[PDB]
Design an enzyme around this catalytic site. Structure first.
Site, PDB file in Angstrom:
ATOM      1  N   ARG A  67       0.823  -1.205   0.000  1.00  0.00           N
ATOM      2  CA  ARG A  67       0.000   0.000   0.000  1.00  0.00           C
ATOM      3  C   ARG A  67       0.859   1.258   0.000  1.00  0.00           C
ATOM      4  O   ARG A  67       0.571   2.214  -0.730  1.00  0.00           O
ATOM      5  CB  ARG A  67      -0.929  -0.014   1.211  1.00  0.00           C
ATOM      6  CG  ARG A  67      -1.712  -1.304   1.372  1.00  0.00           C
ATOM      7  CD  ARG A  67      -2.718  -1.184   2.497  1.00  0.00           C
ATOM      8  NE  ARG A  67      -3.701  -0.146   2.221  1.00  0.00           N
ATOM      9  CZ  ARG A  67      -4.625   0.261   3.079  1.00  0.00           C
ATOM     10  NH1 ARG A  67      -4.726  -0.264   4.289  1.00  0.00           N
ATOM     11  NH2 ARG A  67      -5.467   1.221   2.715  1.00  0.00           N
ATOM     12  N   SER A 126     -14.500  -5.735   1.314  1.00  0.00           N
ATOM     13  CA  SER A 126     -14.463  -5.277  -0.071  1.00  0.00           C
ATOM     14  C   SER A 126     -14.010  -6.395  -1.000  1.00  0.00           C
ATOM     15  O   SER A 126     -14.677  -6.702  -1.994  1.00  0.00           O
ATOM     16  CB  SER A 126     -13.547  -4.060  -0.194  1.00  0.00           C
ATOM     17  OG  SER A 126     -12.489  -4.117   0.747  1.00  0.00           O
ATOM     18  N   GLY A 127     -12.892  -7.035  -0.678  1.00  0.00           N
ATOM     19  CA  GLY A 127     -12.425  -8.158  -1.471  1.00  0.00           C
ATOM     20  C   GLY A 127     -12.019  -7.816  -2.887  1.00  0.00           C
ATOM     21  O   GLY A 127     -12.371  -8.547  -3.821  1.00  0.00           O
ATOM     22  N   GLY A 128     -11.294  -6.716  -3.075  1.00  0.00           N
ATOM     23  CA  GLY A 128     -10.743  -6.409  -4.379  1.00  0.00           C
ATOM     24  C   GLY A 128     -11.634  -5.622  -5.309  1.00  0.00           C
ATOM     25  O   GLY A 128     -11.341  -5.548  -6.506  1.00  0.00           O
ATOM     26  N   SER A 147     -16.984  -3.872   6.611  1.00  0.00           N
ATOM     27  CA  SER A 147     -15.673  -3.992   7.246  1.00  0.00           C
ATOM     28  C   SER A 147     -14.660  -3.880   6.112  1.00  0.00           C
ATOM     29  O   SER A 147     -14.226  -4.890   5.553  1.00  0.00           O
ATOM     30  CB  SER A 147     -15.536  -5.295   8.017  1.00  0.00           C
ATOM     31  OG  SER A 147     -14.300  -5.351   8.703  1.00  0.00           O
ATOM     32  N   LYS A 180     -17.795 -11.808   8.609  1.00  0.00           N
ATOM     33  CA  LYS A 180     -17.103 -10.989   7.616  1.00  0.00           C
ATOM     34  C   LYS A 180     -16.902 -11.824   6.363  1.00  0.00           C
ATOM     35  O   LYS A 180     -15.789 -12.271   6.066  1.00  0.00           O
ATOM     36  CB  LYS A 180     -15.769 -10.468   8.151  1.00  0.00           C
ATOM     37  CG  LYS A 180     -15.228  -9.262   7.401  1.00  0.00           C
ATOM     38  CD  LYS A 180     -13.715  -9.259   7.359  1.00  0.00           C
ATOM     39  CE  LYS A 180     -13.164  -7.862   7.148  1.00  0.00           C
ATOM     40  NZ  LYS A 180     -11.733  -7.758   7.543  1.00  0.00           N
ATOM     41  N   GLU A 211     -14.417 -14.588   9.542  1.00  0.00           N
ATOM     42  CA  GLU A 211     -14.163 -14.173   8.165  1.00  0.00           C
ATOM     43  C   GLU A 211     -13.779 -15.395   7.343  1.00  0.00           C
ATOM     44  O   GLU A 211     -12.592 -15.735   7.228  1.00  0.00           O
ATOM     45  CB  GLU A 211     -13.073 -13.107   8.096  1.00  0.00           C
ATOM     46  CG  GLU A 211     -12.750 -12.660   6.680  1.00  0.00           C
ATOM     47  CD  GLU A 211     -11.564 -11.729   6.618  1.00  0.00           C
ATOM     48  OE1 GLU A 211     -11.162 -11.217   7.681  1.00  0.00           O
ATOM     49  OE2 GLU A 211     -11.043 -11.499   5.508  1.00  0.00           O
TER      50      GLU A 211
END
Lengths: 343, 343, 343, 343
Positions: free
Chosen positions: C41, C270-272, C299, C228, C186
């Site tokens: 990031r 979100s997952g991409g 989340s 999640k 999750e």
């Protein structure tokens, strides 16, 4: 806690029956075929399928001479065959007993589709299986056969199919053991497709591990059970060729990784291989260097009867000929069972 | 489909290690004890627990004379013992290899409570177990030990406890096999309570069946694994007395009903019985009439070291005495492993 | 029988924490990123990854104005972020509580490969998780995060992968609940491959059913847990396009078929997907006609911080700009959580 | 991968049927008493059990006036009741349809013992269930009932019993859904013994979690299914008394922790409580503060017919009286279903 599913007397009786079925040099003659299953076998000759024709064919299989006695330790019969009689009026179960064999019965009611699976099936036949098994026990049937069919596809066998077949086999085994009948667990895996020996071994290991976990969960007395697994062989469409030694290695390895030694014996099914091929594969399995704690015998329908039917031709003139073909094939399969088959 | 968890070379190496550990006449010296676990043993004498004291005690266990070589096929070490050296500077793993043994390591990080259970516990130690097992492999450790603890109570072991312990044992075995280390599966069942031999056998069968189903689910190479189960014995508080022959019958029967023959060998743990009792039980197990497809060896922590510790007394003057005590106990346990122990 | 895993006070505290995390209009800011996870990031800008840079970035995320308070109900922190302090000397957990949020911690120690699987992984982090969770509880962390990663391939996820991930999630949840920390389950499913919406829904249903069966088996208090899961979306390589309404239908349908209503809320990851895509999908999910018994909140790590990080640029001059970016993204995600997001 | 067990049209039809059965204000009349099951009911009066007597009793239950229409959304019939006719020659299924109800059929063939369990049973009836369900579908039956019996003992229900009952329920549901018939899953737990409300809730949660895991494993369309669980109540021999509010809290909590919201509705069974007690418990359940995502209706055999049968007395003179009694009891149960029952 521990609630005994079987009393020590019931366990002793089941162990005695199972050890009699797979006594050294002895195997199983799988003569259990429904009206439609034996219809294809009779139509290949040209003889019409009748009650008398079925009775005479099973009499031919069952009234063999004294040379079949030390080779056939058990005979699986269809429901109607259990209540037919030989020409001399002797009932077929009593004919089997008089030859030293153990009378068996097919108690499964065929396979039914599993929803959400790729054509995968589960076996039915548990309804009233206690009463049916008790009646078979009174009628001479001392062991039962339950054919659970699995195949190998790109996504098959699934977890649902393996779990269903293992659970239904365990329920069948529990009912049979409660009724004094030795259950032969058959998690048969179809040799259909291009899958190789390695994948067949993997699938057989997974299926057998799930089957024996289910048997443990159902408190199945494994000493009073027999196993009827598919020989670990490549699929019929597989291009790669495997020797009988490799097939024997894979089969024995799959059995040793999953089957507990408490199982009295493993009675292989032919599963679509020729008579000679099945006998050679059984001989190689019994000649496998790996230590084999169980009696590796045969439970053959086609591998003991294809030549018998072809010699018979559906007419009475070849009774002795078909008897001789079946007898020598049983001799060969017994020799393979002891590991002494040299074609 | 079938993704090979191990290449044929890794399978061959694991099988070789496992067969070396349980080679005929050889067992395992479970010298693995944490700082607090060996603290109780050292406090029974009056000798303070120090790094030097632990090092000298493990040197005494490991530097025994030549007669202990054909009796100990493997030694389980604690993490700090793997990196200590003998008096001559020769490291403890190299001391073990020089005697023909196989170096082992305790890789489990103890038991932790399971919520919602009656005091049941699951074993931890999977965090970074791949890196730890690789490091142990570079440091000479060729097999690993993972103690999963189960007990027998009115509602124990539960489905959750058995399932969790089997799953964690299978994960430990997968990691160890991936790192070239033979995993010794220990689904130990505590002999605590008034439960009899029958219930211990039932619980052992259930636990072992679940353990091997989990091992199958995790694609564990069973030929590269060993089993370290509790001897099927009545609880410590059980009023009914069982002979050594009965205990051997129950233990061998429980093993044959659940353990597949592919397992290289079964290395029993003492589990709170005296040295003589453990040796006699192992001898009776190896003298059991039932056919035993695995090498039934010993993996004894206290049954090989209690008399040696008492003879040692924590002082250097009894070095030879404790050496002789441990050596004769190992000779007795090897004789029991071959079934030739006559006290 | 029934041994209470949690006392009624423990259950009340867990339910209170979980309901505080997913209170209406509130979601979760997933600021949990390891040194290497946040390294990618920070490298997208060109700013070097240092302790001070990480601290300032997390302070920028956490020191937002009063407009973030009714939108962020919880913040997941990394281990080192939990023990950093803001510029005014205020610790980050106390900064989170001062804004009305709930402090969370990443307790999983990453994923490790599963042997015998097609690149499938299981998550580690259970070693000493009781002591770690207790320490986090004393340090202000009231809920925990455990990322279990599954993917969709031609033979993936397998039974082993789903079962092991569900079991490890259930163990993590049991430990967290025992330590007074709400476990966020999750079972994330990677949107990698060409699989369509239908197969993603099928795999999500299977994974969630196994996860909640494992939670039941481990006596997990579902009212003290949050979920999640991945939004049911087609794979990144899928050619077929699905509307946000179809994605919402599939996601809500998968949740309703598996997740019991006792779960306090479902906090999607979100997952991409882009920030706008994630917000629109969450809004469509909360606008789904099907009745939704849980608080469907967010989340989001990437979907709440991508534009804020881009606007920050790694330099202090854009502190206010990045704060405003994150704040307005949190406002949008809260509006989606209430179903009132109109871009 | 994902092989659709049902086409979207099949799913739509099953959802429509299930929603019609548990439409708001409507419940289920369970007239699915076999010849021996209704024999005890008819012997409580002194009226002999004949074909005509059973036909007249079921006509009395079914031919009630118009005010019972919005209270009964479905009627479960026995096999012989499905093929009987009313006095006017109108078949009983058509009589049910003319009143706005949905015709149901009991497809299970009773319970059979599970070996190795403490008197625990599993339900049979899967043999030819596809053909039977198809025939029932052609005969007007749009939903089916399968009663799985579980009890609470010191070691009961066991893992084997729960797993086998859940698996057989899932197989029954798969067959029924394949044949277009909505399966009502009934994992009934006997209120026998001194177990309290807490243990009943725990056992109900475990049983329902296993049942819905099995339904997921069998690819059961939960929107095309209904649940018929026991009300979470203390055992009949329990000394501690629980209020109707406490029973409702326990029942709704057990349902919310295990039942996914995709289930169309939960149709409670009386399970040995009086008519007034069952109605009050249903009213309290529907008045529970916890959010209930399903239609909590009634499926009462005894709680809808006990006083009606008593008022009938077996003679034709009380036809109107017994019909009025059944009608007002159905009105009370519908009011409880909507939560508006004030006795």
């Amino acid at each position: 806690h521990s609630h005994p599913a079987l009393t020590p007397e019931q366990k002793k009786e089941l162990s005695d029956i199972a050890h009699r079925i797979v006594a050294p040099g002895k195997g199983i003659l799988a003569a259990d075929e429904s009206t439609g299953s034996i219809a294809k076998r009779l139509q290949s000759i040209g003889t019409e399928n009748t009650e008398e024709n079925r009775r005479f064919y099973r009499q031919l299989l069952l009234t063999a001479d004294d040379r079949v006695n030390p080779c056939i330790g058990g005979v699986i019969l269809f429901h109607e065959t259990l209540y037919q009689k030989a020409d001399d009026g002797r009932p077929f179960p009593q004919v089997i007993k008089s030859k030293g064999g153990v009378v068996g019965i097919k108690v499964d009611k065929g396979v039914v589709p599993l929803a959400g699976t790729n054509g995968e099936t589960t076996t039915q036949g548990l309804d009233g299986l206690s009463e049916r098994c008790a009646q078979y026990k009174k009628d001479g049937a001392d062991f039962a056969k339950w054919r659970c069919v699995l195949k190998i596809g790109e996504h098959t066998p699934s977890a649902l199919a393996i779990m269903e077949n293992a659970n239904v086999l365990a329920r069948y085994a529990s009912i049979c053991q409660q009724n004094g009948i030795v259950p032969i667990v058959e998690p048969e895996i179809l040799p259909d497709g291009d899958h190789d020996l390695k994948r067949c071994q993997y699938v057989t290991e997974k299926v057998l591990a799930a089957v024996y976990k289910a048997l443990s969960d159902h408190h199945i007395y494994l000493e009073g059970t027999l196993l009827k697994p598919n020989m670990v062989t490549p699929g019929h469409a597989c291009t790669q060729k495997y020797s009988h030694e490799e097939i024997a290695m894979a089969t024995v390895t799959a059995l040793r990784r999953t089957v507990p030694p408490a199982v009295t014996g493993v009675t292989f099914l032919s599963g679509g291989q020729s008579e000679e091929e099945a006998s050679i594969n059984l001989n190689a399995i019994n000649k496998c260097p790996l230590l084999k704690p169980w009696a590796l015998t045969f439970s053959y329908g086609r591998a003991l009867q294809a030549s018998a039917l072809k010699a018979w031709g559906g007419k009475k003139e070849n009774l002795k000929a078909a008897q001789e073909e079946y007898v020598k094939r049983a001799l060969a399969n017994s020799l393979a069972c002891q590991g002494k088959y040299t074609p």
